[PDB]
Nucleic acid binder design. Structure first.
Ligand code: SF4
Ligand SMILES: [Mg+2]
Ligand SMILES: [Zn+2]
Ligand SMILES: [Zn+2]
Lengths: 114, 116, 431, 181
RNA sequence: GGAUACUGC
């Protein structure tokens, strides 16, 4: 909690219920959108290639999450600023992709699945 | 465009019409490509034949849409009218029966063709 | 070479007001209070996001400009009702609108159109026939009220052109009644010769400042001209920001002995600054702790208060811009200056000249003239002058450098409540 | 539809067109500003990075001036009226052309055009983006070593200019409250 | 190609 943080992101996992209210930059918008698109495409490819309970699936998904810097593991330390940042990413990116993936039923289904 | 962000074929049908298509289908295809429109009997016969060769519902829909759109008709008109017929030929609606392709006996003894 | 060997150094090329001695001296900014004119509208003091103009927003801004000026003029003239410009009129009707040219060229008496506001005319235009108007002076973007008739429904024929109404002058408070007269030296760019980047004229002006110890020094851009031959052809070995920083350091440090309040006004020709009008103040230089109270980075245009004296200033060459478009029935500069004062905007020309980028929301918010200024600094490529237009002393000090040869600056004395003679004396002098 | 970055070599005077961060394929790939386009010319544009900065600022000024010129063209082919003046008479689609009174005036250089031009100038200097997206695997490996750190730093500095300009553009903040409600 | 409805003007 360095400068402008709060209790807005208690846990890693979330149901994505409350839309973000912040003012972000266009560069941040684009970066978050593309990064989560990469994450979801990786999820889809790994689901097609491997069994979702397989250990290969878990290893590859962890590698992708680490590469794109998304929250995937808990931390019993506290809400570190870096962690906060990651969670914020996740929360905003999700809703951005919602805006991207609500035009057509097909798209909707795909999004939901991933 | 995020979804499109980098991070049997219809075309060969014409080729088949050169060699494999029986003369009936060859005539129907020639007329279709000459005028981009077929009377009801031709539509039924050619649709059933293209179902027989293996053209999937999506493939047949795409082919008929592309062929008819050139005939100076509204794009929405196709989905309004001919989509149901195309679906029915594949047993998708109505009684929902997988209608078999016409047999030569049926074609000979089916509706007698007339002018046009 | 030519500049360094000039022989007319210090020559007074123009004079106005009370005669003064051959030498001018100031208070070194001792009993001086310089601020931005505190009006209802907030001043432009920081960058505003630009490059995003909706045509609807431009329409709204122009329409509200016409509507507001017309409302003030209607109250002043006791006009009963305005009529739609486009509708036919067999009898005489009063119409409010703005002038324009029917084509892209320069306005002439046969190419005048009147465009009404959204409230009274739905934004419709009408051609204007100036055959029945005996005296007129029109420029594009000028908000006017005219009495005329439109018998054919296709051509408006004005018969009366209502005169402009300037804003009232400022009524100074007594807080500055006992303050002495203040000396102001004003100069405008370019500050370096066409073939040099050494700022020799600026050094001479700084020497003059330290010699005369004025109370305020108003420096108007450009400080790093975009049209400088060295700049355009990319012969500079240092970044634009570095040259501008060096120039500002020279100005500020060199004026330390004089203790003179510096007012820096940007120019649209500043190659290192944001190219948008109204121009935000410079923000790339942080004065030392010993010069923070002396340096004022103001916006273009600026309305300054100096011990109660209101000075309007703009770096934009308003006179050159409007002289190319003003049409008159029969002093041209005095007419243009009166037009500027009566329209109550520091840039009433619409469409603007080709050399100025106008953000119309910022123009609406930061170009209204709060009052009629006591002194109006309007540097121009045209000849230097000191004119008295409707009681306002309009000073064009020229430009410090005119090509290869040295230019001119101006010095004037201002005291609140003098005699309306707020400008005791003024002089355009050679560098 | 965006203009590419034109820089005249100070030594030879030949125009260099830059449209990507990297030029060439395989191990022969290097940053565009490393070598001149003229084989006989040994001058490295990376040496004259002050001049590149100045030319970039001049180009940005040129594009901003083009946008604020406010040129409008009638969308009707048979009219194609070109005017600087925006009329207050509007239809549902926008300004009504005063030459024909039946068609809409469209901006010759809309805001999207300027935004895309600035984004392209940022793109042609985005080292990290080029490495991730544009560059291949072997090329990425060859470019992710030393011997290019100085070029990387200069490219970062040059991208800082376009980033600064874009930060001052209203076409640079996204209000997520307005999007999600 | 056919069949079943009911709006309009
Ligand atoms: S209907 Fe049968 S016999 Fe007649 S041309 Fe076609 S395939 Fe040959
Ligand atoms: Mg029919
Ligand atoms: Zn070269
Ligand atoms: Zn037109």
């Amino acid at each position: 909690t360095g400068d402008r943080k709060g209790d807005l992101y208690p846990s890693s996992l979330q149901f994505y219920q409350h839309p973000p209210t912040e003012n972000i930059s266009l560069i941040e918008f684009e970066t978050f959108a593309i990064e989560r698109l990469k994450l979801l495409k990786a999820v889809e490819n790994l689901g097609v290639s491997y069994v979702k309970n397989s250990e290969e699936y878990s290893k590859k998904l962890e590698l992708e999450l680490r590469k794109l810097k998304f929250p995937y593991r808990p931390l019993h330390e506290e809400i570190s600023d870096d962690v906060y940042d990651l969670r914020r990413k996740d929360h905003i990116s999700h809703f951005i992709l919602r805006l991207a993936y609500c035009q057509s039923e097909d798209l909707r289904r795909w999004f939901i699945q991933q | 465009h995020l979804s499109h962000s980098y991070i049997i074929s219809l075309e060969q049908i014409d080729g088949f019409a050169a060699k494999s298509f029986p003369l009936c289908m060859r005539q129907l295809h020639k007329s279709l490509r000459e005028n981009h429109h077929l009377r009801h009997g031709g539509r039924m016969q050619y649709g059933l034949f293209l179902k027989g060769i293996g053209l999937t519902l999506e493939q047949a829909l795409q082919f008929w849409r592309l062929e008819f759109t050139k005939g100076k008709v509204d794009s929405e008109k196709f989905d309004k009218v001919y989509a149901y017929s195309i679906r029915h030929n594949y047993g998708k609606e109505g009684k929902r029966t997988d209608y078999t392709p016409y047999s030569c006996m049926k074609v000979i003894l089916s509706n007698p063709p007339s002018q046009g | 070479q030519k500049y360094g060997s000039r022989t007319n150094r210090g020559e007074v090329v123009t004079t106005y007001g009370e005669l003064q001695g051959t030498t001018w001296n100031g208070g070194s900014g001792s009993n001086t209070n310089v601020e931005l004119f505190t009006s209802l509208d907030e001043p432009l003091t920081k960058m505003y996001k630009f490059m995003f103009q909706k045509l609807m927003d431009i329409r709204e801004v122009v329409s509200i400009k016409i509507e507001e000026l017309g409302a003030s003029l209607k109250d002043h003239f006791q006009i009963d009702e305005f009529t739609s410009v486009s509708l036919p009129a067999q009898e005489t009707v009063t119409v409010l609108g703005q002038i324009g040219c029917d084509s892209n060229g320069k306005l002439n008496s046969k190419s005048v159109i009147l465009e009404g506001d959204r409230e009274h005319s739905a934004g419709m235009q009408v051609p204007v026939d100036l055959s029945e108007l005996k005296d007129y002076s029109l420029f594009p973007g000028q908000v006017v009220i005219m009495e005329g008739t439109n018998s054919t429904g296709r051509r408006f024929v004005p018969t009366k052109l209502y005169e402009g109404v300037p804003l009232p002058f400022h009524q100074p408070s007594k807080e500055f009644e006992e303050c002495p007269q203040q000396m102001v030296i004003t100069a405008c760019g370019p500050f370096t010769t066409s073939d040099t980047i050494t700022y020799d004229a600026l050094k001479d002006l700084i020497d003059i400042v330290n010699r005369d110890r004025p109370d305020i020094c108003i420096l108007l851009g450009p400080f790093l001209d975009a049209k400088h031959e060295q700049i355009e052809n990319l012969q500079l070995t240092v970044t634009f920001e570095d040259v501008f920083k060096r120039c500002l350091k020279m100005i500020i440090e060199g004026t330390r002995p004089s203790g003179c309040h510096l007012v820096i006004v940007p120019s649209l020709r500043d190659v290192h600054h944001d190219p948008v009008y109204p121009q935000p103040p410079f923000s790339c230089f942080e004065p030392a702790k010993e010069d923070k109270e002396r340096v004022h980075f103001v916006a273009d245009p600026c309305t300054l208060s100096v011990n109660g004296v209101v000075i309007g200033m703009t770096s934009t060459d308003l006179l050159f811009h409007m002289g190319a478009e003003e049409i008159s029935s029969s002093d041209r500069f005095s007419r243009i200056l009166r037009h500027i004062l009566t329209q109550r905007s520091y840039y009433p020309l619409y469409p603007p000249n080709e050399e100025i980028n106008i953000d119309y929301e910022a123009l609406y918010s930061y170009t209204p003239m709060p009052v009629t200024p006591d002194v109006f600094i309007v540097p121009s490529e045209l000849r230097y002058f000191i004119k008295d237009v409707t009681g306002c002393i309009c000073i064009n000090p020229g430009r410090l450098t005119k090509g290869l040869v040295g230019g001119t600056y101006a010095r004037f004395l201002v005291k609140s409540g003098a005699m309306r003679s707020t400008c005791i004396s003024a002089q355009v002098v050679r560098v | 539809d965006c203009e590419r970055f034109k820089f005249f070599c100070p030594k030879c005077g030949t125009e260099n067109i830059y449209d990507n961060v990297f030029d060439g394929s395989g191990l022969q790939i290097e940053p565009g500003l490393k070598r001149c386009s003229k084989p006989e010319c040994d001058a490295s544009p990376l040496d004259y990075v002050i001049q590149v900065h100045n030319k970039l600022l001049l180009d940005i000024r040129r594009y901003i001036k083009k946008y604020y010129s406010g040129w409008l063209v009638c969308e009707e082919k048979t009219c194609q009226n070109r005017t600087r003046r925006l009329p207050l008479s509007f239809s549902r689609n926008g300004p009504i052309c005063q030459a024909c009174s039946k068609a809409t005036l469209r901006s010759e250089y809309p805001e999207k055009a300027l935004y895309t031009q600035l984004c392209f100038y940022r793109f042609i200097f985005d080292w990290d983006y080029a490495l991730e997206k544009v560059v291949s695997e072997q090329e990425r490996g060859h470019l992710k070593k030393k011997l290019f750190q100085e070029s990387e730093n200069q490219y970062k500095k040059l991208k800082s200019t376009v980033d600064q300009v874009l930060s001052r553009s209203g076409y640079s903040e996204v209000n997520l409250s307005k999007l999600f409600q």
